[PDB]
Structures are given as C-alpha cells and as structure tokens.
Design a protein around this ligand. Structure first.
Ligand SMILES: CN1CCN(c2cccc3nc(-c4n[nH]c5cc(-c6ccc(N)cc6)ccc45)[nH]c23)CC1
Length: 277
C-alpha cells in the first residue's frame, strides 16, 4: 500500500472509501477501494479477479495487509449519474442510450453466465469513458432503493440474476425520461411506487407472490398504469423491451442474453459521448 499515492477521494460507501490514486511503481492511475476479515471473502474476491470483460470495470489487484483490504480497480473518468445530470436539459440522444443499454446487457449476460449477480446496479456505479464505453462497477457481495427489484423488497432471500435486469430497466427508463422511475425513500414507499405504476402484483401475474415473506394481504390494490404514460418519448420497440425487463415475476422477466436479441437493438451503434472531464 506504500506503493500508492492517493490523489483524491472519489467515493464513500458503507463498505469502504474509494480514492483516485497513483501506483508509485506501475505509474498507473487507478481507483483504490479501502475496505474497513473472512477468508471466504478472500476467495470470493479472488474469483472476481478472473471475471474479466470489456463492460466490467477491471479488478487489477487485491491487497490484503493487516486489518485492511484494498482493491485496486481500473480508473474511469465519469459515472453515468454525472453524465445524466450534465445531459438533463437536452437529454442523452437515443442512439447513445441504446448503446449503453446494449453494452450493459453484454456485461450482465457475461456475469450471469458465471452465476455472478451485481445486486446493486445504479447510475452511480456505472462508469463511462471517452470512447463510448460503459462499464459495471461496485459489485455488491443512506442506501438508495430506487433500483431494487420487487422480489428483494418482499423479502425473497434467494433471488436471481433477474434482479439486475430489473435495476437496468429502471436505469433505462431514467435515461429516456430524465427522471427516476421509482424514487422511493423507504422500502414500503419504494414498493408502493412500483405498485402504483405497474399495478399491485397478485397470483395472476406473479404466481407465489402472496406467500413471499413480506407480502401483506393488506397491501393496497392499485391498477396498472398505461405504459405509454410511463416513458412517453420512447418508441414501441423500447417500451416493449422495458416492459419485459420490468416483469414482476422474476421467471418471466427477460434474461440479459434474450434482451440482446430484442428488435430494439437491430440498429444499435456505438456513438461517442461528449464528456466534460
Ligand atoms: C458516487 N460516484 C462514484 C463515481 N465517482 C467517480 C467520479 C469520477 C471518476 C470516477 N472514477 C471512478 C472509478 N473508476 N474505477 C472505479 C472502480 C470502482 C469499483 C468499486 C468497487 C468494485 N467492486 C468495482 C469497482 C468504483 C469507482 C471507480 N469513480 C468516479 C463519483 C461519485
């Protein structure tokens, strides 16, 4: 760790803190996460090092010394959140939204084929570069609930890769409308905001829902809203794909692999964004 000079504090979480740092040796500029421990986690992390893909932020090295764990990541220059904020008055052009969505589905298809889940996708841990790339970061092993799948909120303990598809659907929506799709400030408000838009789930659309740990018969019954009202600007191919990413039933929810074959992506390209760094 003496091999690193911290340049500036990049992020703070409930696990650790992230710094932009320079390797006094390699010369490289990297993102250094200071985790503040389980041997099983040492092996869990050791496995993430092999999980290498163009759309996953590279774990360059793992450094375990004393009562600290440091993870050295590939550095990227901006997060999607900042880019969304910066594009808020014009909106991200559709071709770029499509490219980012496609690339993220590629990243997820990869992860998921290795039975790895992200669990906590959000704009803040999606990182972009000048080349038009977007990458998955901050894999999960005040907390924002806005992107949480309904099965998680209802207490499902052994949830699936489908949770990441739900999160990405919410992010897709957000890029298109320039507003959070489900901005809840508590678990129940998150759940109820979902219900109010997509309708209160029942056994018809989601077999087994009523026997989930935190499901309550006393949940209010709201009707599903018209989808054309939810992401207006978006064309029918986009809305179609979104609806399949936001299916209640995790087993009906589209896979990353299947989503990549959706008609929406027939004309996909790779624009370059204009980044102000
Ligand atoms: C809230 N945001 C976060 C992003 N922040 C940020 C701003 C500007 C440039 C940034 N570059 C990063 C970054 N590069 N590489 C990373 C790797 C992880 C990582 C961490 C954990 C894992 N597991 C994998 C990768 C997290 C963050 C980064 N983050 C940046 C701005 C504030």
């Amino acid at each position: 760790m003496e091999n690193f000079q911290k340049v500036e504090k990049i992020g703070e979480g409930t696990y650790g803190v992230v710094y932009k740092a320079r390797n006094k040796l390699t010369g490289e500029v990297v993102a250094l996460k200071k985790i503040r421990v389980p041997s099983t986690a040492i092996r869990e992390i050791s496995l993430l090092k092999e999980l290498n893909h163009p759309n996953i932020v590279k774990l360059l090295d793992v450094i375990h010394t004393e009562n600290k764990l440091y993870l050295v990541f590939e550095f990227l220059h901006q997060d999607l959140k900042k880019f969304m904020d910066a594009s808020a008055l014009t909106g991200i052009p559709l071709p770029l939204i499509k490219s980012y969505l496609f690339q993220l589905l590629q990243g997820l298809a990869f992860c998921h084929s290795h039975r790895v889940l992200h669990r906590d996708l959000k704009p803040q841990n999606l990182l972009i570069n000048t080349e038009g790339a977007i990458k998955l970061a901050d894999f999960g092993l005040v907390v924002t609930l806005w992107y949480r799948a309904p099965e998680i909120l209802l207490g499902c303990k052994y949830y699936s890769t489908a949770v990441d598809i739900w999160s990405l659907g919410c992010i897709f929506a957000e890029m298109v409308t320039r507003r959070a799709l489900f901005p809840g400030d508590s678990e129940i408000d998150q759940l109820f905001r979902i219900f109010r838009t997509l309708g209160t789930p029942d056994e018809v659309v989601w077999p087994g829902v009523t026997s989930m740990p935190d499901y309550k018969p006393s949940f209010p019954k709201w009707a599903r809203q018209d989808f054309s009202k939810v992401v207006p600007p978006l064309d029918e191919d986009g809305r179609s794909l979104l609806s399949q990413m936001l299916h209640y039933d995790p087993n009906k929810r589209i896979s990353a692999k299947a989503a990549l074959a959706h008609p929406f992506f027939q004309d996909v390209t790779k624009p370059v964004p204009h980044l102000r760094l």
